[PDB]
Design a protein around this ligand. Sequence first.
Ligand SMILES: O=C(O)CNC(=O)C(=O)O
Ligand SMILES: [Mg+2]
Ligand code: NI
Ligand SMILES: [Zn+2]
Length: 331
Amino acid sequence: AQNPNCNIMIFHPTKEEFNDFDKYIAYMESQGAHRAGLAKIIPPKEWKARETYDNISEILIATPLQQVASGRAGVFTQYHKKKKAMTVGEYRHLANSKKYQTPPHQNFEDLERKYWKNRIYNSPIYGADISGSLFDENTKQWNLGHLGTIQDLLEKECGVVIEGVNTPYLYFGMWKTTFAWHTEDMDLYSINYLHLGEPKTWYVVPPEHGQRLERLARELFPGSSRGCGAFLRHKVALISPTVLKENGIPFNRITQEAGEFMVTFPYGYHAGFNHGFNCAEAINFATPRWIDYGKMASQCSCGEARVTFSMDAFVRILQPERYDLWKRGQD
Ligand SMILES: O=C(O)CNC(=O)C(=O)O
Ligand SMILES: [Mg+2]
Ligand code: NI
Ligand SMILES: [Zn+2]
């Protein structure tokens, strides 16, 4: 078996290899990339997402979210407090203010230490889940707005026609903005492009050991776990690398920089944080190999997780037994 230690693999496709998205994802999996739960893809030097970012200030972040932490430094939950709308221009100025700017640091390792030591004592503001794309319509390769849809994949594999669409989202980050431990909805894949700005650090647990993470999480968040069998679906729990090592949870870390793609694989739990002002674009996708994961994916039916319109049909087709109970949590 390829990649038996489940290391995060980094790929450098040629412009010729960057032409066919599906084929390249299959190639990465033939090399064992999926075993890590996350891969990095460096685009060919010839490729560009768009010509410039000079005109992005006017995007509206309708609902900025302040991420407020409770708990201890290495084991905490965060909730999202809604703030008033601001433009990307205003957000970028806020990110760079003294209150919110990245602190002086020697290197990524020093910044990681400061994140985990001080994250809980501050509340950064995240512009998350904004529908839209920054890929130029004439960018033809790995354009996250022009991938084959999940609904077409499900139709090709299973012969059923369903409603729904699947479009990209933009994320505007600042120092300490955090993504909690999670898999994708229905354990889909994700692809994330860091368009501009400061890096994003990622932690990931190999899919083959996801249940060990979930067991630790049940122990670390005992109330949350009582309230919902799939409470990691709430996307609120953080667990530091130090705590993961103490508990023998296998994981890996890697830092994404601007111009780089990350791909998360089905049932790869991931979490991370942003180093400073940045903008990422992401979307979920499927391949034939996802279908079995989608069929076995855990679901939140407590009401907290509350997901897109498109997810209904995935549950309806792939998890018909779970559909009634799950939809009762959506209504
Ligand atoms: O960029 C972020 O904040 C979160 N991204 C992801 O969880 C992803 O692309 O799968
Ligand atoms: Mg603009
Ligand atoms: Ni994700
Ligand atoms: Zn729940």
